Amino acid sequence: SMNPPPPETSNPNKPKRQTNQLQYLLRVVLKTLWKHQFAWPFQQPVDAVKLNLPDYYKIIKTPMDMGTIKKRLENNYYWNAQECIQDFNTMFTNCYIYNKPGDDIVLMAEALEKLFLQKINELPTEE
Ligand SMILES: O=NC1=c2cc/c(=c3/nc(C4CCNCC4)[nH]c3=C3C=CNC=C3)cc2CC1
Numbered sequence: 001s002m003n004p005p006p007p008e009t010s011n012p013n014k015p016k017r018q019t020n021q022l023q024y025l026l027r028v029v030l031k032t033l034w035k036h037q038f039a040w041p042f043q044q045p046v047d048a049v050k051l052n053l054p055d056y057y058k059i060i061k062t063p064m065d066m067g068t069i070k071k072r073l074e075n076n077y078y079w080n081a082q083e084c085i086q087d088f089n090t091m092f093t094n095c096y097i098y099n100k101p102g103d104d105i106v107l108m109a110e111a112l113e114k115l116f117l118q119k120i121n122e123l124p125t126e127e
Contacts, residue, residue, distance in 0.1 A: 060098055
């Protein structure tokens, strides 16, 4: 049921920046979501083989998860905050594509997304 390689968390030829907004995304946004009671499905790439979701990566062609995001932030992988925000948005939207309203995974994504947006609304202005 083979899994694809997980998304990269480093890329030496990719140009990178550190910004106060990206630091906030790690210290506040990622850390807050990571500790949540509904974080567990999202702390690592979907193991479609072991979870018996054989069509997961047949439907989801741009997978993303908070384990990947956490390592990207720790590795200063991003050029700007928007790039990181895009990864969270991909993670949530993949759930809404793969699953139906009311599925536990969707309820979890929705709760995390609500919290994510609350924290993003307080993103500091870039210094
Ligand atoms: O859109 N579908 C998604 C989906 C489906 C299932 C899971 C999921 N992930 C796990 C992990 C938890 C840690 N141990 C390895 C397995 N376990 C599960 C799991 C197991 C049983 N029931 C629900 C989820 C994670 C996700 C993220 C997006």
